[PDB]
RNA sequence: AAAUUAUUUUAAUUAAAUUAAUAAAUAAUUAUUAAACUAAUUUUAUAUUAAUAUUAUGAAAAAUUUAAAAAUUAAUUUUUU
């Protein structure tokens, strides 16, 4: 009958032991930021390298973590090709680094 | 200590220069 | 590793789900025979019974002798103090 | 407005086209198709990009730029800073004050 | 009641209520015989004709002209859908609310008709119920004299 | 400052313009050494607005509607701000009781109409 | 603390004082295509105030004294303002309704008759004007005794009904029942109503043509159409009440969540502009080229770039060891018959 | 208001326009047209809930903020930690319990083993269910119906059975058979004026099982 | 202690009448696979254990 | 906020996507007026249904029975309860090879109960509080730590912190004083007369949405996986993890309704796309707590009811992550067999004594009629 | 034992029952209560009959054994089915038992005046159950749900003037031209 | 003058309480004087 | 059980 | 004793009595939630309450009053976002 305490779940990472919260809420362990590249209070969100919380992920980029660390060896193999999702496969493209040179951006290629 | 609210300022308290002097009778407070 | 990096390998006392207590307890019963309490919902008199009725009786006044007969309330400055040790049961 | 003539030409808009927060979306429906009546001069361009760089802004003619956050802001807002563009130049910073209400 | 039932029959209500008498279960063999259908035939009545608390079927609409634009269902033990919850039961303070559960239609006509019943208590509207505030078990029974002349 | 406060008087400054009758004359005598009274006849105020002589005053009032600017004063700020609740219900009822006399004349109508149909 | 008001207490800021728009009659639609189907210095500052004096009169009773103030400002409006202008046929629209009080039924309709001739030749007209241009025309045909023309009052509505958006009234004032977060006291603003007679000119005239045409067909004894005024009139007011329905929010008093405002005084769809408007009617359109999918037969239709070699279905297990590679095997194979064509 | 429409009043917003929210979805939009409620983060939850706890209600001062001033809160650091447990509520002035005089050696309502409290079936809910149709007027009434018809639960059959009363019922139009246990004496001479009947059964707890359960 | 023993075999489902709190939202492929082969292991992993 | 009013764009278009707005007319990719976080249109995630979902046709499905083409009564006589629309519906259902046979009427309980989202969210709720890794959320407690329970220096005369026995939570090596432990973690009772009423908004919802499709017999020719995504390449289905997936309520054909999935099906239903084949039901037993108060001491557990929907139930969270609905009538003989005595029991009483008249309580017990499917 | 209207043997006192046949009762609830019953005698046969039907290989090894050890199994049905089949029997008597006085009323009756008023003095037919049963015929109150579509009130939402568009894909778009929003104050 | 943001903001440079509603009479409850519970008039008074 | 002591 | 983590807010105030092998308890205050418009006046002006939460005994400048006070004590209006 008394419905659940949806508190923060499936939306946002766990909250981090404040003052105020019931008994039932399920808040970060100690010793643990509910934020996980925020190591400092300045460590600025890193660009494409998602760490996937929850289930299982769906699709598993090659440069998201998953239980896991960066390495640079087993993350991004080669540094020069890069990848997405494109009709739910993990397809390679070059990587491409913008520069403009008539006034409009160029998708020239990076290595 | 009797902590109330209204048992004195609200807040700890402040001297702000329209204090300082006009304090409560507009005599000036003691000190500063 | 992480909590203690030491305090943490090493293993002492483990705790686990802790017992409850008899959750009709604070119908204590001190009150379960002193008072008894009667009323409509959202009207509950804690009625008790006279204060001097069993110590001193010759010569104390002839129409205060039976003022101990009656079922008074209790003034609600205590209707509030016993029946706080109740709504404890599902605060908030 | 200098002259008549605006000092602002573009109004650069990253959005996605599917992914969420809709604001942006729900403006380029109801607001900017009229928004682009009142100034035809402003040269609007749109950009549909994965991770939408989450601001609106001008380029000013005067080569300036002025950027504004748009995070978490509804479509009447998004709205407003679109005509809090064309009408500042960006071109001096004054505190409204006793030296400055008369800038020369 | 007929001194609640004037407090409706005197609103200015859209939606007429039935007339008082014809609204009433509670009125030639032997002077007339009881009105659970109890035949001559060494009387064999019929389970649910008559009723003592004043249960019945809902008597109908009130002219056949309208069309009354919400419907208030029936509990699934028949009674009517108000109920006069309280502010803060844990304190037990006596300030109650009430709450209108099982109504279908549209709530707005049909708390547009409350209104004009207590045009002083607050009333929000909800997806499933219609709180009144500051009405006690005596506004409980003005909604069902109402209910009922509305003829659900 | 309870005196102030029946003068519609608090902060310094302030102004009202309050009539001589009994009860006021002891409030402001109370507090004379807080106000400054200046005195009208009603003839130097029948034209310090521009008034005909013959219009009263009895009559004016009787025209602007008593729900001036903060209506009433009732004995606390709730019942002020149910005052000013039902105050806003009775726009809800007074466009409600129109939308419904709209629909009582329409069906005292489809009544007649489907009544004569047979006729 | 109880206030007094009694030294200027300057006006609440509060979403009931927003500058609506002045209803135009849509882009590609003029007047009579749906009527015949059924600058200098001139001291507007001191003819405002003129016109206005004028109204106080027509409300008042004076009407011919009323009639030569806006005599004056039907001469001044029509030098400042150009040929054509709509500003100039409001006036010589409420002049046309001043002769009618005072029996002049021959310039009245006449210099009402302009207005239309002044209003369908504009471009984009305000419907608050036009759907006031045939009510007066409608109140000036009967007042000549006219009996069935004076029932255009039918043709008022039969704009409203059809290019009036019910529901751009009440946009920013359907939500304010939210903003309250006390109870018991301060709490009237809970039940914040503004009536749609204030805040909507063209529903009320609509009410009031609709509401003439009810008492033209009482004299003339046309049941029939009595009913059509009435079942109109009410099919009107419900669709514009229903504008402004919606349900409470949280009833007891609330704390604190002040940064909640942001969330309801917003760009809320009224449910005209929802049901109108759904996205399964009205559809998004969605172009392939700027997302990264398409429905299984499209799959070459997405984002463009340079090189690429699809993979594998970026299943997570291909971080784990040999074993669950050795499993997950003919996966991709499978898939690949899951999107051809 | 343009007093004019070639002179439109510009858009140069405020505080309460160009600080806004994107419209979530209310419960009404989505009751209007379902067609929006498109993920699980529509199905916000009940308006009145409006979050979790986000203060600190300390005592004689408001609600105050988290992160806000502890000055005050001398008595809510004190009001925390839980009221006395084993110990007498009142510190001083002989508490109201212990002026009080000891009365009938078990309490004033006791129930000792054997007690006769019955719960009280209201006539007219019995009267209500036979019209209803949850009861059958033929059949003795027994306290298996009443409890397997839905008209009473679990919670309200205790030992001594239950016990019949006239409560403002002034009449009963039908023959009505019952056994239950002890009909207060109105409710007695009520069934018996319309020809019914009422065998007060006072089983034993024994016999209040294989009633129930036969 | 006491857990409701005369209800484990007599739900309608292998996967009803036992508590398992150890769920997730989103169950993979290989995740379902263990859990379907998971509910009739411990209802067959009981049997055979209270049969022997 | 609206700080970095600098540096955060660039003045330049991508010479590939970027573009210019052209004008009014310029029908822009994602716009529309309404606030919709998921902007899909008719050809992204298209709806399987009669007419596409518009506010005119009460429900996007044949209301009436469409003359070239069987019919099917429902399994049971229909009721219209407090909540059901009151609208009567006709559901074309599929063959497996993509045709449409005999359309049939669905009930209007079920099917039929209008949405009201505060009444689907004690559905979400508790499943985004029933599928949490309880057990993941231990935490170490002060006591649980293993260090000194003695101070090594007590605190007498110099500046040393007024602290020993540095096993609490303060120190880089401590644990709380009320930690985080499953068996204080509640897991919420939920009914089943909020349930059922959670699943039948939704089940209407993806109804009224139009994304609910029946097929005859949801069977493979083959147990493989292949034969799977062969299959829903013939109806069309999108299991692949973006497009929206399919969610198979597997009850069996027509005349052979089954609770236990097709064998054939349940092989070739795991495929690592997203799809979930969940159990024919709407209702499940009333919640227990044996461990009511404390009863057992050593129990792991979360808090409430010792007896949790299943994963595999129709639950709120899964019926919105998944577009479309595929149902076997052989679940709908089922979910109408299951709810018909629930249905019946939630009419008022000048109702509820109607029906037998009317050909409702046929009793089969009795023999007043040969007995149903 | 009561459960029926034989009298629990608490008419030890001999209490007659006298005025009898007099009521037609037509089993309403009971018979709801009986689809009930028989409802659960059928789910429990289901549960005492489980055989391992191991549809994975890893524990297979059951395959043809019950699923229920053979002394539970042999109590279960005992205790619980065995049980549901009394209370089922329980209602199915009840029932029985009133059809045999309606067989008896509905005799007596038909004669007296009518055999066409009959099934009418013995109707339920309030004149509201076309709400219920076919709401297609009902007009007389507005009980949808969705109330703004009852054909009373379909004049609320707006018909919009509706386009597809091959262009885009035949996506349909609405032809409505947008209101432009309030703005600023 | 002084003026900050509100009816009763007014000179808020004296150190007086504003919003504190001079006009109400004081609570003096359980104090003992003859001030008490009396509208001014009835100070003389002091023999009630 | 055995109670909270 | 030391601490108790989240700016831009949106209704006010003090109290000072019964008792204490001397302050977890009571009034009164404050607080959370909620309330109903009884003659008195202007067409003025009015925070009155209920229900719960509550680890408190001492009030600037005055006006005076006890006391070797050499201040404490009574006093009663202050008591700043």
């Given amino acids: 009958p008394k419905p659940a305490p949806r508190y923060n779940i499936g939306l946002r990472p766990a909250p981090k032991r404040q003052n105020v919260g019931g008994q039932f809420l399920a808040t970060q362990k100690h010793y643990a930021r509910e934020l996980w590249y925020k190591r400092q209070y300045y460590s600025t969100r890193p660009f494409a390298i998602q760490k996937h919380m929850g289930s299982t992920p769906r699709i598993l980029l090659d440069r998201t973590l998953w239980r896991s660390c960066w390495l640079t060896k087993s993350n991004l193999p080669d540094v020069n090709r890069w990848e997405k999702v494109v009709n739910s496969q993990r397809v390679t493209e070059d990587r491409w680094a913008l520069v403009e040179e008539d006034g409009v951006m160029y998708q020239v290629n990076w290595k | 200590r009797a902590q109330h609210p209204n048992a004195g300022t609200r807040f700890g308290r402040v001297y702000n220069r329209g204090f300082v002097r006009y304090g409560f009778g507009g005599f000036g407070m003691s000190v500063y | 590793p992480k909590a203690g990096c030491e305090e943490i390998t090493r293993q002492g006392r483990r705790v686990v789900l802790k017992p409850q207590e008899y959750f009709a307890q604070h119908r204590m019963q001190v009150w379960q025979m002193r008072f008894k309490e009667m009323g409509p919902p959202f009207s509950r008199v804690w009625v008790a019974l006279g204060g001097k009725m069993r110590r001193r009786r010759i010569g104390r006044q002839i129409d205060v002798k039976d003022m101990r007969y009656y079922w008074r309330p209790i003034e609600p400055q205590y209707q509030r103090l016993y029946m706080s040790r109740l709504r404890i049961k599902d605060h908030s | 407005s200098r002259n008549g003539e605006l000092c602002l030409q573009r109004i650069i808009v990253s959005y996605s086209p599917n992914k969420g927060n809709p604001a942006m979306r729900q403006f380029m429906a109801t607001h900017l198709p009229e928004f682009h009546r009142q100034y035809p001069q402003v040269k609007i361009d749109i950009r549909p990009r994965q991770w939408p760089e989450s601001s609106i802004t001008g380029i000013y003619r005067d080569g300036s730029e002025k950027a504004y956050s748009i995070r978490f802001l509804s479509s009447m807002g998004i709205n407003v800073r679109f005509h809090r563009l064309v009408n500042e130049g960006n071109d001096y910073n004054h505190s409204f004050s006793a030296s400055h209400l008369h800038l020369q | ?152 | 400052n309870r005196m102030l406060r029946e003068l519609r008087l608090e902060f310094m400054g302030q102004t009202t313009v309050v009539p001589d009758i009994p009860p006021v004359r002891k409030r402001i005598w109370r507090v004379r050494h807080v106000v400054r009274v200046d005195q009208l006849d009603l003839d130097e105020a029948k034209a310090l607005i521009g008034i005909p002589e013959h219009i009263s005053f009895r009559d004016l009032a009787g025209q602007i509607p008593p729900t001036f600017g903060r209506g009433g004063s009732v004995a606390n700020p709730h019942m002020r701000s149910k005052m000013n609740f039902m105050r806003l219900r009775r726009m809800r009822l007074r466009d409600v009781m129109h939308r419904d006399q709209l629909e009582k004349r329409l069906l005292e109508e489809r009544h007649h109409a489907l009544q004569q149909q047979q006729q | 603390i109880t206030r007094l008001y009694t030294s200027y207490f300057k006006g609440e800021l509060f979403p009931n004082q927003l500058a609506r728009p002045l209803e135009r009659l849509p882009r590609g639609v003029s007047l009579a295509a749906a009527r015949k189907g059924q600058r200098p210095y001139v001291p507007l500052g001191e003819v405002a105030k003129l016109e206005l004096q004028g109204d106080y009169l027509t409300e008042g009773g004076l009407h011919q004294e009323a009639l030569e103030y806006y005599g004056v400002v039907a001469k001044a409006y029509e030098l400042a303002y150009p040929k054509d202008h709509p500003q100039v046929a409001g006036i010589r629209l409420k002049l046309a309704g001043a002769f009618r009080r005072t029996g002049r039924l021959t310039s009245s309709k006449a210099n009402c008759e302009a207005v239309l001739q002044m209003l369908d030749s504009a471009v984009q007209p305000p419907l608050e004007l036009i759907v006031e241009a045939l009510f007066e025309l409608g109140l000036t045909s009967e007042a000549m005794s006219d009996a069935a023309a004076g029932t255009v009052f039918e043709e008022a509505v039969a704009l409203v009904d059809m290019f009036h958006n019910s529901g751009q009234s009440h946009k920013m004032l359907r939500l304010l029942p939210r903003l309250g977060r006390r109870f018991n006291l301060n709490f009237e603003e809970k039940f914040v109503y503004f009536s749609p007679f204030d805040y909507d000119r063209v529903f009320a005239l609509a009410d009031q043509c609709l509401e003439r045409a009810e008492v033209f067909y009482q004299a003339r004894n046309d049941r029939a159409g009595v009913m059509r005024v009435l079942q109109q009139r009410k099919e009107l007011i419900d669709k514009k009440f229903f504008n402004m329905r919606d349900f409470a929010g949280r009833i007891h008093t609330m704390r604190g969540h002040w940064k909640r405002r942001a969330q309801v005084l917003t760009n809320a769809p009224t449910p005209d502009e929802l049901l109108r408007y759904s996205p399964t009617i009205h559809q998004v359109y969605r172009d392939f080229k700027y997302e990264l999918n398409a429905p299984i037969g499209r799959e070459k239709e997405v984002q463009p770039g340079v090189n690429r070699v699809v993979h594998d279905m970026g299943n997570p297990y291909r971080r784990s060891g040999v074993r669950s590679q050795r499993m997950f095997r003919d996966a991709e194979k499978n898939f690949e018959k899951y999107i051809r064509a | 208001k343009e007093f004019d429409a070639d002179h439109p009043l510009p858009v140069v917003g405020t505080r309460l326009n160009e600080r806004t929210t994107t419209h979530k979805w209310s419960h009404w939009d989505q009751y209007i047209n379902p067609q929006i409620t498109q993920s699980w983060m529509y199905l916000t939850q009940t308006p009145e809930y409006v979050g979790p706890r986000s203060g600190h209600n300390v005592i004689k001062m408001g609600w105050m903020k988290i992160g806000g001033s502890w000055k005050y809160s001398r008595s809510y650091n004190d009001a925390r930690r839980g009221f006395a447990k084993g110990q007498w509520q009142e510190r001083k002035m002989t508490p109201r319990f212990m002026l009080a005089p000891r009365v009938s050696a078990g309490g004033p309502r006791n129930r000792y083993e054997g007690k006769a409290s019955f719960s009280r079936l209201s006539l007219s809910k019995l009267l209500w269910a036979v019209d209803t149709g949850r009861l059958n007027p033929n059949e003795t009434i027994t306290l298996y119906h009443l409890r397997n018809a839905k008209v009473i639960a679990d919670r309200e059959v205790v030992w001594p059975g239950m016990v019949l009363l006239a409560g403002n019922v002034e009449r009963v139009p039908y023959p009505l058979h019952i056994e239950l246990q002890n009909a207060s004496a109105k409710a007695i001479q009520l069934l018996e004026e319309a020809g019914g009947s009422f065998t007060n059964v006072y089983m034993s707890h024994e016999g209040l099982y294989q009633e129930l359960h036969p | 202690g006491f857990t409701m023993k005369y209800k484990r075999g007599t739900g309608l489902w292998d996967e009803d009448h036992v508590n398992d709190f150890d769920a997730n939202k989103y169950l993979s492929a290989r995740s379902t696979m263990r859990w379907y082969y998971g509910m009739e292991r411990l209802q067959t992993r009981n049997n055979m254990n209270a049969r022997r | 906020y609206d700080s970095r009013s600098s540096g955060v764009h660039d003045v330049a278009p991508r010479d590939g996507v970027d573009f210019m707005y052209e004008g009014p007319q310029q029908v822009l990719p994602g716009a529309h007026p309404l606030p919709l976080f998921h902007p899909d249109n008719s050809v992204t995630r298209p709806p399987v249904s009669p007419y596409l979902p518009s506010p005119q046709r009460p429900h996007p499905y044949f209301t009436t029975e469409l003359p070239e083409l069987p019919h099917f009564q429902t399994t049971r006589p229909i009721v219209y309860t407090v909540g059901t629309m009151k609208q009567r519906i006709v559901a074309p259902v599929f063959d497996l090879a993509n045709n449409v046979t005999h359309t049939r009427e669905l009930d209007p309980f079920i099917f039929g109960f209008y949405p009201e989202t505060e009444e689907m969210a004690k559905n979400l709720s508790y499943w985004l509080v029933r599928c949490q890794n309880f057990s993941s959320k231990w935490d170490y407690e002060n006591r649980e730590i293993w260090r000194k329970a003695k101070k090594n220096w007590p605190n007498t005369g110099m500046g040393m912190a007024r602290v020993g026995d540095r096993k609490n939570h303060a120190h880089p090596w401590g644990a709380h004083s009320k930690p985080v432990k499953p068996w204080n973690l509640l897991m919420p009772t939920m009914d089943v007369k909020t349930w059922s009423k959670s699943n039948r908004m939704l089940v209407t919802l993806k109804m009224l949405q139009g994304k609910l499709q029946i097929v005859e017999r949801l069977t493979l020719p083959e147990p493989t996986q292949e034969a799977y995504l062969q299959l829903c390449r013939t109806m069309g289905w999108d299991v692949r993890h973006k497009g929206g997936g399919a969610l198979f309520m597997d009850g069996g054909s027509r005349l052979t309704p089954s609770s236990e999935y097709d064998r054939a099906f349940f092989f070739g239903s795991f495929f690592n796309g997203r799809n979930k084949l969940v159990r024919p039901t709407l209702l499940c037993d009333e919640p227990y707590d044996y461990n009511r108060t404390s009863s057992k001491a050593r129990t792991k557990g979360p808090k409430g009811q010792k007896n949790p929907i299943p994963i595999n139930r129709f639950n709120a969270y899964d019926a919105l992550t998944h577009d479309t609905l595929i149902i076997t009538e052989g679940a709908l003989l089922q979910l109408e067999d299951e709810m018909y005595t629930h249905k019946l029991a939630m009419l008022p009483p000048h109702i509820r004594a109607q029906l037998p008249e009317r050909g409702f309580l046929d009793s089969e017990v009795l023999g007043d009629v040969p007995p149903a499917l | 034992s009561g459960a029926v209207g034989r009298g629990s043997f608490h008419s030890v006192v001999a209490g007659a029952n006298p005025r009898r046949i007099p009521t037609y009762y037509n089993s309403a609830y009971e018979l709801i209560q009986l689809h009930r019953a028989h409802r659960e005698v059928t789910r429990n046969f289901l549960v005492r009959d489980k055989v391992f039907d191991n549809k994975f290989p890893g524990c297979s090894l059951a395959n043809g054994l019950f699923k229920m050890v053979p002394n539970k199994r042999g109590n279960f049905h005992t205790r619980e089915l065995t049980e549901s089949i009394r209370h089922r029997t329980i209602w199915g008597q009840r029932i029985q038992q009133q059809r045999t006085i309606n067989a008896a009323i509905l005799e007596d009756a038909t004669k007296v005046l009518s055999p066409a008023q009959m099934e009418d003095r013995f109707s339920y037919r309030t004149p509201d159950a076309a709400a219920y049963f076919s709401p297609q015929e009902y007009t007389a109150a507005n009980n949808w749900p969705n109330y703004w579509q009852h054909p009373t009130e379909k004049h609320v939402v707006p018909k919009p003037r509706w386009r597809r568009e091959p262009e885009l894909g035949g996506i349909t778009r609405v032809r409505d031209a947008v209101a432009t929003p309030i703005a600023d104050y | 003058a002084s003026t900050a943001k509100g009816y009763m903001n007014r000179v808020m440079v004296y150190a007086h309480r504003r919003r504190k509603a001079r006009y109400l009479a004081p609570k003096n409850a359980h104090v003992r004087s003859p001030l008490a519970h009396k509208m001014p008039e009835e100070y003389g008074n002091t023999w009630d | 059980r055995f109670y909270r002591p």
């Fill in chain 5, 1 to 152: 009641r007929s001194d609640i039932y004037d407090e409706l029959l005197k609103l200015p209500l859209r939606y007429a209520l039935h007339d008082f008498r014809t609204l009433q279960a509670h009125i030639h063999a032997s002077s007339g015989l009881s009105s659970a259908s109890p035949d001559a035939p060494a009387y064999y009545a019929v389970a649910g004709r008559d009723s003592a608390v004043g249960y019945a079927p809902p008597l109908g609409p009130a002219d056949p002209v309208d069309v009354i634009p919400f419907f208030v269902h029936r509990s699934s033990n028949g009674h009517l859908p108000g109920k006069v919850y309280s502010m803060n039961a844990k304190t037990l303070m006596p300030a109650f609310y009430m709450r209108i559960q099982n109504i279908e239609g549209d709530m707005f006509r049909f708390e547009e008709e409350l209104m004009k019943i207590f045009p002083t208590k607050k009333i929000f509207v909800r997806s499933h119920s219609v709180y009144v505030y500051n009405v006690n078990l005596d506004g409980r029974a003005v909604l069902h004299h109402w209910l009922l002349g509305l003829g659900f």
